[PDB]
């Protein structure tokens, strides 16, 4: 009685699940071959990024012992990146399997204390990347909930966009990095809120008369703006 007879058609028929499997098992069914994802992009640890940090390009320090070898983003990518799907793009900035900085606590009170002091969330440390489908499902659910909350809101799609960007930037695992991308949409929502309030409550101001040199040149057109 053999185990898993009908379960490896990939082996029986020489079907590779990925170019790495193709290269390994020598099926040679990928015309373009395989450029291996190096180990520093397959795994690694969270690092500091900003140039205004002194420990830049250095691994993040935790209370627990952790491998200090960092994930290195693709800084000099090849010209032809044949797969431009999210699956292959995400590997240039995050590891699909998550970071290698996760703890195994010898006790529950260490976990409690780390959480209490803001140094651990399993959401962040024990987790993989999110797939495009998962991201889209989350975004569409949030959009549905917001539309139900209020259809006649102008900041609706801006809120939806910041949610979308957080999900795409994998804020579960890199919240500071994602907020750096999404605060622009938060700011736009902040503006839209006041822009809506001032339309609801009629708020206006006395504009001054036109300036003598409103136009730079007499022959120039003065395009009228509301």
């Amino acid at each position: 009685s053999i185990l898993g007879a009908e379960a490896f058609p990939e082996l029986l028929s020489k079907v590779p699940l990925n170019p790495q499997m193709d290269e390994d098992k020598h099926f040679n069914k990928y015309k373009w071959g395989n450029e291996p994802i190096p180990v520093n992009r397959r795994t690694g640890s969270r690092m500091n990024s900003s140039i205004y940090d002194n420990r830049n390009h250095e691994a993040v320090r935790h209370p627990w012992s952790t491998d200090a070898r960092t994930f290195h983003p693709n800084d000099n990518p090849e010209a032809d990146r044949i797969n431009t799907q999210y699956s292959n793009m995400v590997s240039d900035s995050f590891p699909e399997g998550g970071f290698s900085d996760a703890p195994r606590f010898s006790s529950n009170w260490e976990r409690l204390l780390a959480y209490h002091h803001g140094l651990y969330s399993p959401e962040k440390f024990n987790s993989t990347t999110k797939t495009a489908d998962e991201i889209r499902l989350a975004v569409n659910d949030f959009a549905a909930k917001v539309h139900a909350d209020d259809p006649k809101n102008a900041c609706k799609y801006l809120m939806i966009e910041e949610f979308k960007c957080l999900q795409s930037a994998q804020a579960r695992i890199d919240p500071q990095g994602a907020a750096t991308k999404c605060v622009k949409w938060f700011n736009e929502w902040r503006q839209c809120a006041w822009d809506q309030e001032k339309m609801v409550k009629g708020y206006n101001y006395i504009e001054d008369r036109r300036a003598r040199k409103h136009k730079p040149y007499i022959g120039a057109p003065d395009l009228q703006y509301s």
């Binding site: 012992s65 952790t66 491998d67 200090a68 070898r69 290698s100």
Partner: peptide, 10 residues
């Protein structure tokens, strides 16, 4: 030394 320790622990 810490790097070796952590690799070995993992």
């Amino acid at each position: 030394r810490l790097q070796r320790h952590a690799e070995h622990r993992n």
